[PDB]
Amino acid sequence: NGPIIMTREERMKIVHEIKERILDKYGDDVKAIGVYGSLGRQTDGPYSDIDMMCVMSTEEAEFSHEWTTGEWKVEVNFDSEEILLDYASQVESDWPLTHGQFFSILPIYDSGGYLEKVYQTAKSVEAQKFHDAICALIVEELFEYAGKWRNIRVQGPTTFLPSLTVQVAMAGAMLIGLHHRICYTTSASVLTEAVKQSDLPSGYDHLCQFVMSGQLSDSEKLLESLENFWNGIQEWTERHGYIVDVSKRIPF
Amino acid sequence: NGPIIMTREERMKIVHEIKERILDKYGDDVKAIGVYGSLGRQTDGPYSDIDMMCVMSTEEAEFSHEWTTGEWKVEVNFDSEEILLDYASQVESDWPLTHGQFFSILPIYDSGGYLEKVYQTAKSVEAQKFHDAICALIVEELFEYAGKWRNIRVQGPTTFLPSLTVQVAMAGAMLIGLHHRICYTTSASVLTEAVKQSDLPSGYDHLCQFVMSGQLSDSEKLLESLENFWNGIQEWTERHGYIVDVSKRIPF
Ligand SMILES: NC[C@@H]1O[C@H](O[C@H]2[C@@H](O)[C@H](O[C@@H]3[C@@H](O)[C@H](N)C[C@H](N)[C@H]3O[C@H]3O[C@H](CN)[C@@H](OP(=O)(O)OC[C@H]4O[C@@H](n5cnc6c(N)ncnc65)[C@H](O)[C@@H]4O)[C@H](O)[C@H]3N)O[C@@H]2CO)[C@H](N)[C@@H](O)[C@@H]1O
Ligand SMILES: NC[C@@H]1O[C@H](O[C@H]2[C@@H](O)[C@H](O[C@@H]3[C@@H](O)[C@H](N)C[C@H](N)[C@H]3O[C@H]3O[C@H](CN)[C@@H](OP(=O)(O)OC[C@H]4O[C@@H](n5cnc6c(N)ncnc65)[C@H](O)[C@@H]4O)[C@H](O)[C@H]3N)O[C@@H]2CO)[C@H](N)[C@@H](O)[C@@H]1O
Ligand SMILES: [Mg+2]
Ligand SMILES: [Mg+2]
Numbered sequence: 108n109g110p111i112i113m114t115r116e117e118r119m120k121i122v123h124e125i126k127e128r129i130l131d132k133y134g135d136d137v138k139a140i141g142v143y144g145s146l147g148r149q150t151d152g153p154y155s156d157i158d159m160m161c162v163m164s165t166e167e168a169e170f171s172h173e174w175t176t177g178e179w180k181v182e183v184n185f186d187s188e189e190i191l192l193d194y195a196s197q198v199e200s201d202w203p204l205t206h207g208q209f210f211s212i213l214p215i216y217d218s219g220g221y222l223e224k225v226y227q228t229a230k231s232v233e234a235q236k237f238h239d240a241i242c243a244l245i246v247e248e249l250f251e252y253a254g255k256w257r258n259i260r261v262q263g264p265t266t267f268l269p270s271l272t273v274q275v276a277m278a279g280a281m282l283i284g285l286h287h288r289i290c291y292t293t294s295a296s297v298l299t300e301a302v303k304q305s306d307l308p309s310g311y312d313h314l315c316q317f318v319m320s321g322q323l324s325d326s327e328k329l330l331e332s333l334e335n336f337w338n339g340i341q342e343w344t345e346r347h348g349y350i351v352d353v354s355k356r357i358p359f
Numbered sequence: 360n361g362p363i364i365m366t367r368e369e370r371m372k373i374v375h376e377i378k379e380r381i382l383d384k385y386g387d388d389v390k391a392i393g394v395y396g397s398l399g400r401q402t403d404g405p406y407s408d409i410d411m412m413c414v415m416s417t418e419e420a421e422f423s424h425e426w427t428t429g430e431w432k433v434e435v436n437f438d439s440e441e442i443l444l445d446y447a448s449q450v451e452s453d454w455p456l457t458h459g460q461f462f463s464i465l466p467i468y469d470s471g472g473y474l475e476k477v478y479q480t481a482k483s484v485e486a487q488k489f490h491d492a493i494c495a496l497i498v499e500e501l502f503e504y505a506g507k508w509r510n511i512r513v514q515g516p517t518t519f520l521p522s523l524t525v526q527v528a529m530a531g532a533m534l535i536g537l538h539h540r541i542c543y544t545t546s547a548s549v550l551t552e553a554v555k556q557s558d559l560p561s562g563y564d565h566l567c568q569f570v571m572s573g574q575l576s577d578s579e580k581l582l583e584s585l586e587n588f589w590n591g592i593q594e595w596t597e598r599h600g601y602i603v604d605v606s607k608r609i610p611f
């Protein structure tokens with residue numbers, strides 16, 4: 108019934124059982140096996156799960172095995188070296204949430220320093236990619252969110268405002284992480300680490316304190332905190348040179 | 360800045376200006392042009408944006424133009440017929456959130472009934488795809504969320520509980536939408552439409568009204584409501600046959 112409590116040593120025993128199954132099934136096509144997530148960081152809790160990544164020599168390989176035993180859960184990703192390195196150098200809007208997995212890999216099997224290659228690739232991403240992701244985030248996510256809460260103020264529904272506020276605070280956290288080109292430790296610590304960073308957009312800290320405390324019932328204060336954060340954004344982007352093109356009416 | 364107030368008539372003027380550029384640039388490679396989102400449903404609000412889809416004849420075409428003028432925002436997706444039809448028949452975990460776009464397309468240009476083809480494809484998916492997506496959702500998301508809030512109870516951080524509770528309520532809404540094979544109208548109405556459907560898992564209704572009202576500060580009331588919803592999941596999946604074999608420790 109649900110995830111049960113497990114200690115670190117029992118989880119690692121499962122990891123090596125899976126590693127032996129992987130090597131028995133795929134043999135010399137396995138280049139490397141590593142553990143990421145909290146278990147790879149050696150900070151797994153009693154109810155933490157298991158996340159493993161495998162580097163294959165197998166040409167264009169990209170698949171995953173994700174299952175439960177009813178008591179615990181495992182996910183194993185299988186990728187070719189080319190596919191994995193390409194993904195590790197691609198900066199999407201949620202890069203600060205996702206790509207921390209490449210910075211604390213616990214090696215389990217490695218025939219040729221592949222896990223070190225993935226780490227070097229992830230930490231050497233060209234600065235321009237973060238600049239482009241920040242500008243895309245403002246247009247694709249933040250500008251759209253602003254239209255949604257401004258609609259809520261004039262026509263509702265207020266029952267969406269708590270969920271929307273959570274999404275906006277998360278998007279702002281991604282914006283800060285992209286600026287500092289720093290990945291957050293884990294999903295549970297995204298907002299906690301975001302508000303402790305420097306160069307915050309004005310109004311972001313105040314907005315986060317609603318989400319972190321759970322006080323999301325005052326719709327008129329939420330709308331005002333969102334509006335203050337939005338105004339802070341375009342300040343913030345012109346100070347750091349993240350300028351968005353608003354000049355073309357049809358840009359194709 | 361942000362999105363300004365616009366009327367429906369101003370939005371439709373922009374749509375026909377964009378369609379007119381599309382035909383000039385791509386000519387006979389344009390199979391169809393349609394409007395989706397709230398404008399395609401003719402329920403756009405004062406701050407709503409513009410969402411358009413374009414079916415191309417050029418095989419493997421898949422690109423998008425998404426921009427702002429500082430005052431309003433537009434997104435135009437360009438897809439080949441095969442890529443679009445394939446996507447319209449694939450049932451992911453967020454299918455109830457995304458695939459409503461194929462059920463209320465406002466036609467603007469159609470050289471061969473392609474927009475009707477996309478609609479028929481979207482509504483003619485065999486039930487097995489929804490059964491598999493429901494089972495995948497429980498393993499990949501709900502079981503994982505249960506481990507995360509159980510970690511919060513024993514080790515924190517409690518500041519993540521409001522955001523996690525919102526994610527669980529959304530995942531439950533996807534679960535209900537997949538069961539009934541009905542997509543939600545828009546993101547703002549996901550929770551409102553989810554709790555009005557029949558055959559809900561026990562405890563989901565109570566959990567949603569925490570999220571819909573914004574009262575997410577009582578951490579222990581949230582944790583108990585989450586556990587009740589999780590218990591409701593097990594009876595609900597048991598009763599409807601969304602069962603996966605969980606007996607093997609490594610099922611590959
Ligand atoms: N593998 C290389 C590369 O991966 C790409 O795919 C992405 C992404 O699409 C995929 O997400 C998976 C979903 O597609 C699938 N439906 C369910 C899986 N559970 C998803 O896995 C990822 O998301 C969960 C989130 N619960 C991660 O588990 P966890 O919370 O325990 O976190 C462990 C560590 O992983 C990082 N992290 C945290 N949150 C996320 C999210 N939301 N996405 C991705 N990574 C996250 C964080 O550092 C944390 O410490 C799970 O580990 C994670 N794998 O996952 C991969 C990227 O990993 C493409 N398939 C392709 O380009 C190529 O294969
Ligand atoms: N086009 C065929 C197919 O699309 C696939 O791509 C997906 C998905 O990856 C993509 O999401 C876009 C992001 O990748 C991009 N970074 C930013 C874009 N803004 C995203 O567009 C989609 O998400 C927004 C969410 N705000 C949608 O806008 P909106 O709130 O105005 O909603 C309009 C209508 O669209 C439906 N809807 C609602 N929420 C969503 C979300 N989260 N995703 C997708 N659709 C949503 C709903 O019915 C509502 O009435 C935006 O319209 C939407 N396009 O978008 C497409 C899926 O549409 C692949 N690229 C590929 O398989 C192929 O191209
Ligand atoms: Mg984990
Ligand atoms: Mg995991």
Ligand SMILES: [Mg+2]
Nearest residue numbers: 396397408410
């Ligand atoms: Mg819209």
Ligand SMILES: [Mg+2]
Nearest residue numbers: 408409410434
């Ligand atoms: Mg839109």
